[PDB]
Design an enzyme around this catalytic site. Structure first.
Site: not given
Ligand SMILES: COC1=C(OC)C(=O)C(C/C=C(\C)CCC=C(C)C)=C(C)C1=O
Ligand SMILES: COC1=C(OC)C(=O)C(C/C=C(\C)CCC=C(C)C)=C(C)C1=O
Lengths: 446, 49, 53, 105, 57, 54, 54, 423, 146, 54
Positions: A60-61, A137
């Site tokens: 996703e990153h 994060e």
């Protein structure tokens, strides 16, 4: 004028097509000048093992940071330049990449989505940059007490199963997951029968189908091979995790019984019952007069800051209950009143409040499916979970069937005399002992 | 980093019908409560006498 | 004067609690019969017979 | 304009004098039983009416301890008796009965 | 195009009967949690994030 | 900080018999409550000394 | 005061033998005891409410 | 395959009230009453009155009690919300199609018949503190409130939130006076989604014929300029730099809107580098730590504020402000390509079209338009209006910002944050 | 802070200095609210060790002998490991700070940069202050020469 | 708000026998306190039924 009943019929049918590789392509057409398009994949942390947990999150990153055709910042330059919005999410069960765009831009938007899914150029230096970003994060998410308790509730409810894991993974996974780990994940999971091209807005289904053959057809034409890939049931427990931290100024508590999966008709009645108990926070206007007995008592006696009921669905299981945020001297009173409501609904639910819950659910459903994006999500998600789009008129039929007898039956089935999973974070000395939470799950009078 | 928290293994203490993590607990749910409530039911009967 | 508690919801609430209140009476009747050895009722019960013949 | 309504008023005035809360300088609404409806009506009263009420009750409880009574000139005249609590109480009763009508449905 | 919050920048507050209070517009903090350690103190005498009347079938 | 006010036993005595807020107001008809207590212990005390020989 | 005096009446009758005047007046006093508390005192309270326009 | 959609219908009544409706054939209805009653209409004697008003919408009305509004709305699964800008208040109401009449009745009661009972108003005063506290948890809220206080003498200087000293001190009379001089026919618009125009027109003519109030979009906002500084040590510094720009629905406002997207508004890609964001790239060049920059663009009835908003580390703030301001200066000096204006035009056009996709965004746009312009401007003439912005106009807007008396608000550890004269 | 800030003059003169200066003299005599609970033992130690030093100190005594004071000074007040100047130099900026109260009364102060202490110009300011008028001289007087 | 927690009599029972914070920890040697209470009422009850005939 039209009635509510008539208005649900006038909602246009979702058109579905299957491509030859097994990619499903689906669209709800409206008159809108803008659209949402995206790929919904049957992939998430429930598919991940101990060793690769957090891989999808890592992908996703990387998904937007370059392809074999659009290296580096070239993709985001194209999305930005046409005024499009490119977004992504990852749950335990579903991954999504979607574009908010002008309807005239649907050709390029489908072309970009295919490029992201098929041709992720995961450059070693880029995967190294993302290592530090994900790590930060994790530090950020530590400060969100809501996100922590729900991770805790999953970790205890699904104890030793893949549903216990976080989406992001542990920090050791983040610092040791290699490119080969990532491409193996991509190879195993990003396969045509497991993903859906969804669209909503100013488009014909025909051209959505055309672009799907144009850009997606090199996916599983002969790639239908290896152990393709059975999920297996997750054992729910009935257990407690208590992270005692008196340095935090408010207690978070989430409590759930085992729900049934996506498939089960019982979800509609459970959602009615959850609507009756409802939600609250401190910024709600008029507290004393709220219909929900929990919300009313919580407002008047200052029992909490917020609560929410929930029904989180997975394949063949879920988490049904509530979460709240309150002062240290209030957890006992909150838990008492919450449990009493569950018990009340099991034993002695009445016709009038069930109507209110039914109405709240019609209003929630219709108010949610409002915009190209939530409709596109719903097309995409529903085809993964139900295998159809369940039309608005069907939900209304399912809602209408629910009466007091159904609420009493269906709540009793899941709530009455069942072992809850409990997660506590913060100043939680006054969090009731588990035996006394277990004892709150039945009534001696009944 | 709170994501490093796994709940530790409880197999040592678990009831036998609840050791399989791959299999539903809902199936053994009626039986397990059945056994424990029968104990208290018999005790009440015993005390009642 | 008690008219507060008369309406469709209280009619439903009474209906819900009826099987329970019936069973709590059934609990208490047998419990009285058992505690006193109520001879009148227990003569009927086909195996509980302390009196011979 | 009625001889009979003057008669009922004269029985009422008679009763008022017989009741004799006016002898302690009380108004009718000072003597009402404090239930939940009444406690709320008192809560709803504006500053001036609140502070007058406490002093009247203070003055009465003081007299009732001394077992004494005000000079006749200072008795509250029946015609001058302000029904100051009643409109708030009617509204509090009106609001409760609406709730009770909703609890029925 | 006459609307201050749709122009995206100036501040709007929302109250409701059933739904959480909202603030504000397009000031940055979506490309600000992206280079990271914006912890933002999330949950200290405080309402609910994300809002809820958006429930499924 | 008072010994009368915070000692776990004297607390009970103080909040019943000493600092208890009472109306300015209550007449001789309110004397009978304590008188019933006096009656109770009188009957207890004499009754005990009668029980010693009965 | 009718209740107190009626109670005083009933203790007088209690003291007397079950013979002519005493049987009837004791029956009437019994009836009055229950009529005063059940019927007559609640009705007095309503009348008093109505007289104060309450 | 959808139905051919209905056109919006629009009516100005002689009394100045505006009715606009759309029959989407939707299961739900949305109804808003938009009122020129925002915080700019407060003065120095009644600050915070429109905040308490915003919180007061389920208090007792004439034949609808507090209890009844809460229970009746919730019984049909409905909402009642109140949203406020410095210019407008907006009372909106949602339910299913079949339930419009009851929610309309509650709406009309809230807006034209509130009782403001002394004790209800009293029990509500603490809610100002809770509401303000929750809002002011975002540093952006402090900054933009201080920005408006710094910028203006007057009117637009007023906060959306009650000043602390006024909490507990706003009265039932002040509420009554506020409604009676602002909630009037010539200051109102009644918008409805999924209702008929005859029903709305009828409702408007029967229930919304009020006047005994003010006339204008106000006492005119005097732009002043200045700076407000709030020491925090918050790890991060939030700053906003601003100059007077253009009133809403002038041609110059569109130039500001386009410049905002040249310089860069929000992000477009989850976790992206913001490649075509010219402020973000300019700061990124000489700063190698977590930051943010956006262009800031607030347009009002009689004024505007344009510039930029920064978040940065305390030590980096000066550098981030100077990099950002130099990037604007460089467009004022004329260094602006035709493709860059076109991309900004694409982002603005698509942004606007996405803005009105939902009922909530559609109704708010139609409502504010009706108050600002007295008219409804369809999407394609907004797009035409955006297209007509020349390159020179965007250069001219940047020129106006650079040369114009500044306003600044900032919060954090301000030890390395510059004053206006240091810029 | 609460007790001091009961006089409106305290708010005004603190805000006046914050408005006037970039720096140094802009600082309040009273701790900023956000710092209450947050000032540390280290910060106190560091403050004493860089400010409470021989070249920054004076020891004054009334009704003591000079030999006793001189002795005390030489035995006990020989510190240095600190700063030198009368500081980082105060930068006068100019500006205004406004605090809405509705206090029935408005307190205002208007000010410009004047003269450093013990310059000749400071005496000119001191005299002008008494031309224009400082405090009162007569209980309940009209202040005729003010 | 709990009936167990706020009723003036049940308050006493709850703060002694139900919600009372006790160590996780106390062994069988702590059983004798309750056992002395059981002993006390056993002796009271039998002692009463012996007093009926003594
Ligand atoms: C608030 O009103 C009260 C009184 O005012 C009229 C009293 O005079 C008394 C005094 C009562 C006594 C001495 C009897 C105690 C009984 C026993 C069994 C020890 C009490 C307790 C009381 O509460
Ligand atoms: C904090 O420790 C406590 C215990 O933990 C070891 C107990 O078990 C009990 C239980 C005691 C009983 C049943 C005797 C009551 C005596 C009379 C005269 C009624 C009490 C009160 C107690 O305080």
């Amino acid at each position: 004028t039209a009635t509510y009943a008539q208005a649900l019929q006038s909602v246009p049918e979702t058109q579905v097509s299957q491509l030859d590789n097994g990619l499903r392509v689906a669209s709800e057409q409206s008159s809108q000048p803008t659209c949402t398009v995206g790929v919904w994949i049957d992939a998430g942390s429930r598919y991940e093992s101990e060793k690769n947990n957090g891989a999808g999150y890592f992908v996703e990153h990387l998904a937007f940071k370059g392809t074999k055709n659009r290296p580096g910042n070239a993709l985001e330059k194209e999305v930005e330049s046409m005024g499009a919005h490119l977004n992504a999410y990852s749950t335990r069960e579903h991954t999504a990449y979607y574009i908010k765009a002008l309807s005239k831009d649907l050709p390029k938007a489908v072309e970009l989505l295919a490029d992201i899914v098929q041709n992720c150029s995961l450059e070693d230096s880029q995967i190294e940059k993302e290592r530090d970003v994900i790590l930060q994060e994790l530090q950020e998410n530590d400060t969100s007490m809501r996100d922590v308790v729900f991770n805790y509730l999953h970790a205890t409810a699904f104890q030793g199963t893949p549903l216990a894991q976080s989406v992001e993974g542990p920090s050791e996974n983040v610092r040791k997951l290699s490119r080969a780990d990532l491409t193996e994940y991509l190879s195993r999971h990003y396969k045509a029968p497991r993903m859906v091209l969804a669209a909503a807005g100013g488009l014909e289904h025909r051209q959505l189908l055309d672009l799907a053959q144009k850009h997606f057809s090199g996916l599983s034409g002969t790639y239908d091979e290896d152990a393709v890939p059975t999920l297996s049931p997750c054992r729910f427990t009935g257990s407690q995790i208590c992270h005692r931290e008196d340095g935090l100024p408010l207690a978070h508590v989430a409590i759930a019984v085992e729900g049934p999966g996506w498939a089960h008709p019982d979800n509609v009645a459970l959602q009615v019952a959850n609507a009756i108990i409802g939600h609250y926070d401190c910024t709600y206007g008029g507290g004393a007069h709220l219909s929900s007995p929990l919300a009313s008592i919580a407002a008047t006696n200052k029992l909490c800051q917020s609560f929410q009921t929930f029904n989180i669905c997975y394949a063949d299981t879920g988490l049904l209950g509530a979460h709240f945020v309150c002062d240290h001297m209030s957890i006992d009173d909150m838990m008492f009143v919450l449990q009493g409501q569950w018990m009340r609904l099991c034993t002695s639910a009445t016709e009038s409040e069930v109507l209110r819950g039914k109405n709240l659910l019609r209003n929630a459903l219709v108010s949610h499916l409002d915009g190209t994006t939530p409709v596109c999500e719903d097309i995409g998600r529903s085809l993964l979970t139900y295998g159809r789009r369940i039309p608005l008129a069907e939900w209304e039929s399912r809602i209408a069937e629910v009466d007091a007898r159904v609420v009493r039956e269906v709540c009793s089935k899941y709530f009455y005399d069942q072992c809850p999973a409990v997660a506590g974070f913060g100043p939680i000395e006054q969090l009731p002992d588990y035996n006394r939470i277990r004892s709150g799950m039945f009534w001696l009078r009944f | 980093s709170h994501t490093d928290i796994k709940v530790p293994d409880f197999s040592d203490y678990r009831r036998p019908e609840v050791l399989d993590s791959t299999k539903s607990s809902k199936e053994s749910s009626e039986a397990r409560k059945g056994f424990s409530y029968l104990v208290t039911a018999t005790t009440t009967v015993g005390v009642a006498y | 004067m008690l008219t507060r508690f008369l309406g469709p919801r209280y009619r439903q609430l009474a209906r819900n609690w009826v099987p329970t209140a019936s069973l709590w009476g059934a609990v208490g009747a047998v419990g009285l019969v058992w505690a006193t050895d109520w001879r009148l009722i227990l003569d009927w019960v086909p195996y509980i017979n302390g009196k011979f013949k | 304009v009625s001889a009979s309504s003057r008669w009922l008023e004269g029985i009422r005035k008679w009763y008022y004098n017989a009741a004799g809360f006016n002898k302690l300088g009380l108004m009718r609404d000072d003597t009402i039983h404090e239930n939940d409806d009444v406690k709320e009506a008192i809560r709803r009263l504006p500053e001036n009416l609140y502070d007058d009420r406490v002093f009247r009750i203070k003055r009465a409880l003081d007299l009732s301890m001394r077992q004494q009574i005000l000079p006749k000139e200072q008795w509250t005249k029946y015609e001058e008796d302000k029904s100051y609590l009643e409109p708030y109480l009617k509204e509090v009763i009106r609001e409760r009965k609406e709730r009770e009508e909703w609890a029925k449905k | 195009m006459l609307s201050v919050a749709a122009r995206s920048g100036p501040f709007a507050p929302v109250l409701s009967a059933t739904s959480r209070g909202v603030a504000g517009a397009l000031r940055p903090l979506v490309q600000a949690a992206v280079p990271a350690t914006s912890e933002s103190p999330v949950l200290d005498l405080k309402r609910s994030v994300l809002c809820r009347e958006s429930l499924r079938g | 900080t008072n010994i009368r006010k915070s000692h776990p036993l004297m607390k009970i005595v103080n909040n019943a018999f000493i600092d208890l807020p009472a109306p300015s107001n209550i007449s001789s008809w309110w004397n009978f409550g304590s008188l019933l207590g006096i009656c109770l212990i009188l009957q207890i005390l004499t009754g005990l000394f009668l029980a010693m020989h009965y | 005061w009718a209740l107190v005096a009626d109670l005083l009446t009933l203790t007088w009758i209690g003291g007397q033998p079950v013979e002519h005047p005493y049987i009837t007046i004791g029956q009437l006093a019994s009836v009055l005891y229950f009529l005063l508390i059940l019927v007559l005192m609640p009705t007095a309270g309503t009348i008093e409410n109505k007289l104060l326009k309450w | 395959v959808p139905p051919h959609p209905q056109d919006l219908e629009f009516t100005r009544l002689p009394n100045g009230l505006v009715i606009a409706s759309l029959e989407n054939y939707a299961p739900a209805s949305r109804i808003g009453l938009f009122i020129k009653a925002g915080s700019r209409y407060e003065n120095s004697n009644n600050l915070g009155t429109s905040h308490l008003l915003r919180l007061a919408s389920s208090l007792t009305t004439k034949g609808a009690s507090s209890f009844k509004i809460t229970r009746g709305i919730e019984a049909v699964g409905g909402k009642l919300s109140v949203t406020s800008t410095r210019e407008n208040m907006a009372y909106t109401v949602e339910c299913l199609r079949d339930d419009v009449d009851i929610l309309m009745e509650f709406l009309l009661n809230v807006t034209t018949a509130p009782e403001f009972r002394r004790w209800e108003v009293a029990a509500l005063q603490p809610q100002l503190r809770i509401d303000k506290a929750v809002a002011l948890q975002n540093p952006q809220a402090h900054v933009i409130e201080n920005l408006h206080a710094a910028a203006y003498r007057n009117a637009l200087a007023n906060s959306l939130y009650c000043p602390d000293y006024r909490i507990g001190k706003v009265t039932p009379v002040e509420l009554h006076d506020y409604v009676q001089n602002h909630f009037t026919s010539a200051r109102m618009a009644l918008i409805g989604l999924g209702v008929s125009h005859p029903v709305l027109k009828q409702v408007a003519e029967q229930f919304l014929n009020i006047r005994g109030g003010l006339g204008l979009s106000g006492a005119k906002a005097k732009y002043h300029g200045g700076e407000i500084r709030e020491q925090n040590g918050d790890s991060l510094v939030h700053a906003a730099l601003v100059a007077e720009s253009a009133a809403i629905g002038s041609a110059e406002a569109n130039a500001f809107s386009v410049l905002q997207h040249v310089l860069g508004a929000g992000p477009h890609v989850k976790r992206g580098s913001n490649a075509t964001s010219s402020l973000y790239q300019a700061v990124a060049k000489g700063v190698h730590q977590p930051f943010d920059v956006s262009a800031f663009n607030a347009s009002y009835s009689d004024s505007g504020l344009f510039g930029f908003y920064t978040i940065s580390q305390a030590a980096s703030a000066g550098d981030v402000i100077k990099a950002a301001y130099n990037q604007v200066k460089t467009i004022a000096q004329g260094n602006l390509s035709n493709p860059d204006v076109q991309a900004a035009k694409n982002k603005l056009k698509a942004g606007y079209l996405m803005s009105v996709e939902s009922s909530e965004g559609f109704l708010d746009e139609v409502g504010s338009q009706a108050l600002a312009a007295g008219s409804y401007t369809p999407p394609s003439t907004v797009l035409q209006q955006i297209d007509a912005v020349a390159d020179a106009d965007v250069i001219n807007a940047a020129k106006k910002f650079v040369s114009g008396r500044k306003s600044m608000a900032a919060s954090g550890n301000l030890g390395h944050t510059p004053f206006i004269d240091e810029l």
